[PDB]
Amino acid sequence: NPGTVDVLHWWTSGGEAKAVETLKQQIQKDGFIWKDNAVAGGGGAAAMTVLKTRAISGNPPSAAQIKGPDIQEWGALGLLTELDDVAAANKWDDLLPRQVADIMKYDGHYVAVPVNIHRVNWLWINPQVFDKAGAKVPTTLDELFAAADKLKAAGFIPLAHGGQPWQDSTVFEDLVLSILGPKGYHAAFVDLDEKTLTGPQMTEAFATLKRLGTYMDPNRAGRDWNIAAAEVINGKAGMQIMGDWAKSEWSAAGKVAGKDYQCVAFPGTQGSFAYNIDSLAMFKLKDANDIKAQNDLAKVALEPEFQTVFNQNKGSLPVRQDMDMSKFDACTQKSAADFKEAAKGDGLQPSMAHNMATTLAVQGAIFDVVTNFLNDPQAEPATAVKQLNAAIKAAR
Numbered sequence: 088n089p090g091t092v093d094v095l096h097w098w099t100s101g102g103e104a105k106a107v108e109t110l111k112q113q114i115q116k117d118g119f120i121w122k123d124n125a126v127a128g129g130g131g132a133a134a135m136t137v138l139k140t141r142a143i144s145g146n147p148p149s150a151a152q153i154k155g156p157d158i159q160e161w162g163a164l165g166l167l168t169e170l171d172d173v174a175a176a177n178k179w180d181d182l183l184p185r186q187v188a189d190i191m192k193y194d195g196h197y198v199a200v201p202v203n204i205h206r207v208n209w210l211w212i213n214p215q216v217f218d219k220a221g222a223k224v225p226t227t228l229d230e231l232f233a234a235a236d237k238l239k240a241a242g243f244i245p246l247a248h249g250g251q252p253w254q255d256s257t258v259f260e261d262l263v264l265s266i267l268g269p270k271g272y273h274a275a276f277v278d279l280d281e282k283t284l285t286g287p288q289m290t291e292a293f294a295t296l297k298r299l300g301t302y303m304d305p306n307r308a309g310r311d312w313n314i315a316a317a318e319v320i321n322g323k324a325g326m327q328i329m330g331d332w333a334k335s336e337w338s339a340a341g342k343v344a345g346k347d348y349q350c351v352a353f354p355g356t357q358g359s360f361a362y363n364i365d366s367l368a369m370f371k372l373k374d375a376n377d378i379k380a381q382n383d384l385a386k387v388a389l390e391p392e393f394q395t396v397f398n399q400n401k402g403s404l405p406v407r408q409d410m411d412m413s414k415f416d417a418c419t420q421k422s423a424a425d426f427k428e429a430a431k432g433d434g435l436q437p438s439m440a441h442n443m444a445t446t447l448a449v450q451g452a453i454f455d456v457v458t459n460f461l462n463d464p465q466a467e468p469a470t471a472v473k474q475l476n477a478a479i480k481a482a483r
């Protein structure tokens with residue numbers, strides 16, 4: 088017709104839209120139609136709502152942004168197409184880290200293609216604001232609170248943080264990873280180990296979340312992750328606890344590491360890398376030309392020029408392993424090194440708040456407990472760990 092590529096995704100902020108624009112361009116350059124279904128919401132709950140309808144509609148999208156264990160559900164439903172021929176030709180097993188390749192498969196077959204590797208456990212710092220505040224870039228939880236104290240004394244928003252469950256739980260899983268360490272983190276969120284979920288360290292994670300919440304804006308509720316990023320970019324806030332999609336906002340605003348921002352591992356998580364892999368699950372299509380388009384999309388995703396330009400704009404690492412890393416920024420090169428380090432040990436771990444560690448149902452119970460707790464200044468950590476365990480059990 089020539090064929091139309093319809094991807095359902097939630098890349099809509101200033102930076103993320105710059106990244107998706109690279110994909111629109113490549114598809115147009117290849118001679119297919121780009122016809123976007125961008126559904127705005129950060130972390131993707133809104134997009135899923137739209138997907139829950141389109142998926143069974145009779146006009147499924149070509150691909151949707153579906154990650155983690157949730158792919159297994161779409162795979163199990165028989166809604167996704169197997170990508171055996173494209174994966175064989177373009178050598179996907181060779182190009183992708185094994186830990187990532189396994190996630191893309193249903194019963195042995197690729198049914199989704201990854202595009203990136205986000206790290207979730209970053210802290211973003213405005214060095215000009217830290218210098219005005221006489222604050223020090225934190226390496227520990229104690230240093231984090233010291234910087235926060237100083238930022239507050241100096242008149243700044245200490246912690247730029249949007250009030251949405253997925254953001255609350257990004258911060259919380261940072262704290263779990265910080266305090267419990269990667270192995271204990273693994274036990275809580277992957278294995279859902281009751282004893283770990285209700286133990287003293289998890290309890291202390293809630294205690295720390297509560298104090299951290301005493302440095303957040305009282306009126307943060309409903310504030311998108313880009314509004315919080317912007318508070319830092321504009322010099323109103325010292326820091327934001329956010330994954331490296333946050334960098335797409337910095338890069339879109341023309342900013343440079345060192346001078347305008349710094350990226351540091353979330354305090355006490357050095358050596359651990361909380362991954363989030365954006366991936367596009369490919370639905371079985373009926374129309375012949377849209378099938379050709381879908382095959383083109385599947386080709387493009389791991390092409391090295393696309394992997395480069397998409398990820399420079401996106402904030403993430405490329406998922407393809409043979410990449411000239413010198414073409415990316417210093418923070419992205421930090422992330423690669425830290426990825427490598429983490430992946431040798433048990434530091435590499437899936438993000439719970441970004442759909443890699445759990446099913447969406449279990450994630451939902453976690454979100455509700457974390458957010459209900461954070462939003463009640465007088466709530467007891469000992470109570471929070473009981474509810475966490477009970478709600479998780481109640482979800483599966």
Ligand SMILES: OC[C@H]1O[C@@H](O)[C@H](O)[C@@H](O)[C@H]1O
Pocket residue numbers: 097098103128129130131312332363364365441
């Ligand atoms: O919406 C904010 C972020 O949400 C993540 O879950 C998604 O994987 C990222 O690509 C970014 O879009």
